Amino acid sequence: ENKKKLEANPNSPEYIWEYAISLIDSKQYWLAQFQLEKYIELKPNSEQAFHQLGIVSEKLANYEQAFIYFQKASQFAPLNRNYKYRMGYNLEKLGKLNEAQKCYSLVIDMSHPTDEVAQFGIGALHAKRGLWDMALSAYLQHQIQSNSQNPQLYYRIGIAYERLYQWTKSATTFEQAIILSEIMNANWCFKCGQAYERAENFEKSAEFYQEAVKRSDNYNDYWWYRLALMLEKLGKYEQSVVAFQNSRRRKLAYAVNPKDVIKHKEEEFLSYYTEYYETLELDEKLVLIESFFGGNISCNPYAILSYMLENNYDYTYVVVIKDGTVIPDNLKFNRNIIFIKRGSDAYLRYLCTAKYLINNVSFPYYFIRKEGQVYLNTWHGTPMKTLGKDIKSPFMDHANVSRNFLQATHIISPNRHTTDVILEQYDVKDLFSGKLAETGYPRIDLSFNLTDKRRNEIAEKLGFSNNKPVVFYAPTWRSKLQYDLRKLKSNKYNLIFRGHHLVEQLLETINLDVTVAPKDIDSNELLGFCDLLITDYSSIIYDFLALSKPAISYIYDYEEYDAERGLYLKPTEMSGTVCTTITDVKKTILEHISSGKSNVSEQDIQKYSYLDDGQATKRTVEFMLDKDDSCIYKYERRKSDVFFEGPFIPNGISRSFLNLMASIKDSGKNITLLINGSDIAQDQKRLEEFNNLPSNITVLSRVGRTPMTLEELWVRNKFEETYQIYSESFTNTLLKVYKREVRRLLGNSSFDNAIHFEGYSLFWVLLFSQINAKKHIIYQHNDKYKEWKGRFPYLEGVFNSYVFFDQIVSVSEKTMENNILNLSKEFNIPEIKFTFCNNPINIQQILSSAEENIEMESEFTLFNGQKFINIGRMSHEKDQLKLIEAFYEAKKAHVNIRLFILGDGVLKQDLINKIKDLSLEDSVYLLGQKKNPFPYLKQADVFILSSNHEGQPMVLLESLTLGTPIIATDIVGNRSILGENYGTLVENNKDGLVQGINAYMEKGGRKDKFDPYEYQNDAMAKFYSLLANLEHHHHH
Ligand SMILES: [Zn+2]
């Protein structure tokens, strides 16, 4: 490329070496030979010079001079292995076979015993240079000499055959490496199908192309394309089209570009899933198995997979694994089992194609059960600590589990205790539209039916030559375990321990009689293998009680663990022998080993283990395939109404929602509330307002992003940017997002009424329009047109979405007509859709707050003539300056008067400044912010509201139920609640408030005849009139 003979300045080793290497890199070997001879004349001790001369002489086919040069280089660094190999190669090319073989032997003996030349011979170093004829010969020699059966060696042999264009030998060799493999490799299956194609065996080529795409974790369009070609050559045109259609990750005509649409990586990942969800067909002979997020293959899903394997069920099985997941022995060398990694492309496709899904915890947030899919959630044990909706530690942490139960069609239980706890503590009893059957855990079958074969294999895999008793210690995650395992050192029994992968790795096993159970052995097999079980707070004890063996509940830290996790059971009512010290554990072990007595109470077996007869897996499988209804827990579901309040900001909307919740709490219905848990967990005051809900409220929280296709992301982003109605197809595309999201959150649930109570959040307006309900209702708490043009642009999208609801309910009749005037004609909403419903009040709490809470009251209210009260925020909208000015004028005519103000705010200091101006320091008192103002509101004589803007003046009704009358400025908020019949209204000026004070002092409080129960009965009757009859379920 470059001459570099440019520097004709001679005799310089630097320039000579520069020119020589440039000649070698340009493959001008004969020309570089003379320059390296000149360098050796100058520096006759450069090891690199002898290295290059050996390379040059070998490229020049001077094999004798190559050996001489490589030898002179090797004695410059006898620890260099590449030199010794090149010595042997050039001797082999020379014909000196024996001298070369002694060289190869030195190369082998001086190599680390897992470097490739150790397990695969000297041919691996030929392969590193592309010398495939010599690599194949050495591979074949090393296989025959070692009788090796390593699949990796057969793979390297097939690679050599492939680069020699001996395709038939390459294909058959790859098939051996695959057959000899513990788990079939997707990459190997492609190399085998590729070689079979080049050999023109199309049936074998299609066979292994099919294997490759079935087991490929990542999407490979190339492999789908090659499979489709081979299927076409075979004449299978239908399957050829399917593979051709799948030769593109995205099949749909989105008419949009992914680069301009996708903002976040999660959006791209979810877009592939959503297409798979909508387009891929279910395989009626496919079963997916997942246990503990693929971290291991154990528990109930493993027992079901094992049962259906040994009974030869006609299925293909997909087992979900992670990196480094240990594989049980009975699953190796099985072509009917496909291992795919969680979260991969194959994971998403198989979640959308497997007809039968089996899990013991939960699928991730994006999983949606397709129609015709069977999802069996087995769970993973009898619960013993605080669990689910009572765990406040991460807010709404159980939400995806409650989601998964709503996605499930079948659920199994080990005992009625677990049935009650799961259905109640995950808030899904009335919503769960599937089937729950009490079959007992199939994992217990692995303990009952341990074979003498497997028992002997576990014994030799452990190192137990004698039939000494086996003691199994399996505690839960939370040093003492070191002290406890020394104290249990004994020759009388074999001690087996299983704990957390972290605990077992830093155990220091010497000085210990203990054996850490290998991770390839199931815990239920260990229960049937052992003779005595030691545990503390693990649900594995209830797998044990039906095995007629002694158990020990060793609970040294019951105080600490109960304080942290809250245990269901007291110490005296746990199973087996309850021990609090380690010396008592050893004493109890030897007592029971010698006596042979059982120590498990039969009352415990009747509570938790009455279903364990070693046949639960047949019951579960027949239940899942809808062939055995004998174990179903049939019960009556309540009808359900679903609500949305918002993010529970403490405001007028939340206070009205809480009052409505208190009024309907004993209606015999399931009141469901949908929330966004992340929007509430941030604010301490939002959580406090959320915690005031009645305890019977079923609560579901959205988890994660909404899965959307490519065009669905564009359509949504466009709508949430322009808020316009565009066409029928555009609207249907947008609404398809929210019907899918309703399914993701609720499954096949159905409700009587879906009530969007907030009326603001656009996401929840479109979502509630798609809930399967008999009636869809959305509230209006304000003048929506003023809120739209004042603060919230997205309210335009809400107005263009009122078409998707049946009723639009305002919180007052005045507000209703205002909303009709501003929205009905402008947005094509029929007048008949609009209605109103007065906000409910909690009469019992108002009455209880005023009469109870005998609290510290200022001495200046306790003694006076006429008392006037006002609660506000000093936000200028309350306008307390016009109040104190009307007071100064009203003190003239009548003087035996006092006034009190509650609250705090910005315009505070200006109030105390005005206190001295009117010289009323002893006639007006500015009390603090009171956490319970109802004692003051009852004991006062007049409640004054001088406000200029009032949104939800509910204190006005509150005071009137307490029997203390009202004077309030005639603004739109105070008139919407009072009108002309309740309370006394005045103009919004100083003179109007003085007239109201003076009119009260002559004539008294207005004789409005306000009945709090009449207002409550009217408000609730209007509410119940808005609900549905026995009408038909639908979505919009
Ligand atoms: Zn409807």
UniProtKB/TrEMBL annotation:
- According to its UniProt record, which protein family does this protein belong to? Belongs to the CDP-glycerol glycerophosphotransferase family.
Against Pfam families, the record matches this protein to: Glycos_transf_1 (PF00534), Glyphos_transf (PF04464), TPR_16 (PF13432), TPR_19 (PF14559)
**Membrane topology reported for the UniProt record:** Peripheral membrane protein
Q: Does the keyword Cytoplasm apply?
A: no
User: Per its record, how is this protein called by name?
Assistant: TagF-like capsule polymerase Cps3D
Spell out the PROSITE patterns in the cross-references: TPR
Question: Which residues are recorded as binding Zn(2+)?
Answer: 776, 806
Choose one Gene Ontology CC annotation of this protein and give it.
plasma membrane
Check the record and name the InterPro entries matching this protein. Answer: Glycerophosphate_synth (IPR007554), Glyco_trans_1 (IPR001296), TagF_C (IPR043148), TagF_N (IPR043149), Teichoic_Acid_Biosynth (IPR051612), TPR-like_helical_dom_sf (IPR011990), TPR_rpt (IPR019734)
The gene is cps3D
Annotated coiled-coil positions are none
Q: Which organism is it from?
A: Actinobacillus pleuropneumoniae
Q: Listed GO molecular functions? A: CDP-glycerol glycerophosphotransferase activity; glycosyltransferase activity; metal ion binding
- Intervals holding TPR repeats: 47-80
A Gene Ontology biological process annotation? teichoic acid biosynthetic process
This protein's UniProt keywords: Cell membrane, Membrane, Metal-binding, Teichoic acid biosynthesis, TPR repeat, Transferase, Zinc
Where can this protein be found? Cell membrane
Tell me where in this chain the Glycosyl transferase family domain is found: 866-1014
